Write a protein that binds this ligand. Structure first.
Ligand SMILES: N[C@@H](CCC(=O)O)C(=O)O
Ligand SMILES: N[C@@H](CCC(=O)O)C(=O)O
Ligand SMILES: [Zn+2]
Ligand SMILES: [Zn+2]
Ligand SMILES: [Zn+2]
Ligand SMILES: [Zn+2]
Lengths: 258, 258
């Protein structure tokens, strides 16, 4: 009856409200995906409960066991009915879960500490002084692992063998490593996150170069779920009425600190 | 057996080749969607015939008869098996046909003759010396018809009543109208088309302002078609392999003249 919605604590998509300890249920959280969940539910006519993914991951498949983890795993194994999160539409995921048409367009981008002498992925690939990595267990890592493009495969070959590990567990971890490393670590992450952090104090990062690829986030449901059709129409309706653009301005720019 | 593909003459998606008259069947055409059709057919394992939509339109629904025309109508009434074209994914279309995940991202943009005193949509709406319109029977017109945004609804109010008509039957006619109007006509069209034309002789137009919205083109199939699933997985594969980006540079930027 009540739809279980899996999501992930990733700013500004879903964040704990300042006073969450005094609030209950869905009211504990705020953010772009919290706002969007409320609208999808109202347009599709269901009640829902927001739940934070237990392992804190977006999702990947273990090479050995073939088991899915993260939000993808929660849908695949029946622990949640829908995921409303910055979850990237990819071929390997569409093979095991369903996605709506995208609600946000984005691409992989580079985050540097201001003043770092890097302007592009080609620049990162041609040097060794500045380290760089991506989030573990997400679509960005898979992009580099799978790429046949020479620049990106060169980047992958470095990243997969760098020690200590250049991969991080959360976006926040990646941004902190950029901020604390004096220009000697650059972080590869989606343009949406990069753009958001660029407007947050202490205003010491910047996005550089163009996007490396072009993709989308979608609302995900278990394969053949009865909800997929209505959720897809809801995303299209809300895009056409300007809601998605209005939400992006609210959470990225209206609140910008830089 | 042979899959009938509906498409539309729209540069640089589908164009007649230089020496088409000595060529036959699919070989008569070239462009981004021609290459894309060949890739999709190779991955999905079918043979196909390209056919240009009889009425030269993308597709809209007649408000009195409720009959669909254009490429959307060819799908709806069973005259074609698949549409491979710059066809915009929209709510009202998703109600009668199926769409793949998008193969290209885009937005509505403004095209002016160079030197025209217009910088934005708000600029057009606050004056009257320069007329402006959109393509008939497409998603851009409908966007303005349905817009609740003050600047956009106001534009629509002007466009719908304008005399003589500011709407055009083809993109080519819109561009020609901009070029021959001495700065007194501006054209609202998708950013993909705008960006292509800006790079072609006689280099007298320019895209101005940001995109007015964000959406995508998809490969469309009749509702419940056997083809839909494979076609969707194929578009995702092609994007991940970087082929879509390669095609984009081949047809937009390697082909610039200005
Ligand atoms: N949006 C990504 C997570 C972030 C990233 O990989 O950079 C995913 O769905 O895996
Ligand atoms: N891509 C549009 C046609 C061009 C336009 O409306 O600007 C459609 O599918 O309707
Ligand atoms: Zn807390
Ligand atoms: Zn609403
Ligand atoms: Zn001829
Ligand atoms: Zn191929």
């Amino acid at each position: 009856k009540t739809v279980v919605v899996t999501t992930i604590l990733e700013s500004p998509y879903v964040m704990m409200k300042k006073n969450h300890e005094m609030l209950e249920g869905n009211e504990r959280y705020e953010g772009y995906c919290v706002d969007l969940a409320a609208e999808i539910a109202k347009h599709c006519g269901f009640k829902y409960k927001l739940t934070i993914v237990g392992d804190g991951k977006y999702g990947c498949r273990d090479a050995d066991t073939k088991i899915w983890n993260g939000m993808v795993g929660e849908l695949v194994y029946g622990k949640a009915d829908i995921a409303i999160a910055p979850l990237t539409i990819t071929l390997v995921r569409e093979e095991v879960i369903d996605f709506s048409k995208p609600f946000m367009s984005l691409g992989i981008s580079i985050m540097i500490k201001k003043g770092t002498p890097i302007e592009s992925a080609e620049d990162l690939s041609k040097q060794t002084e500045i380290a760089y990595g991506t989030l573990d267990c997400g679509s960005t890592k898979e992009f580099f692992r799978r790429s046949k493009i020479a620049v990106f495969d060169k980047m992958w070959t470095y990243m997969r063998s760098a020690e200590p590990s250049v991969f991080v567990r959360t976006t926040a971890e990646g941004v902190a490593r950029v901020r604390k490393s004096k220009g000697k670590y650059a972080y590869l992450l989606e343009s949406t996150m990069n753009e958001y952090i660029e407007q947050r104090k202490p205003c010491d990062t910047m996005k550089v170069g163009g996007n490396l690829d072009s993709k989308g986030y979608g609302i995900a449901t278990p394969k053949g779920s009865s909800l997929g059709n209505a959720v897809n129409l809801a995303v299209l309706k809300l895009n056409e009425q300007g809601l998605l653009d209005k939400l992006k301005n609210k959470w990225w720019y209206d609140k910008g600190e830089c």
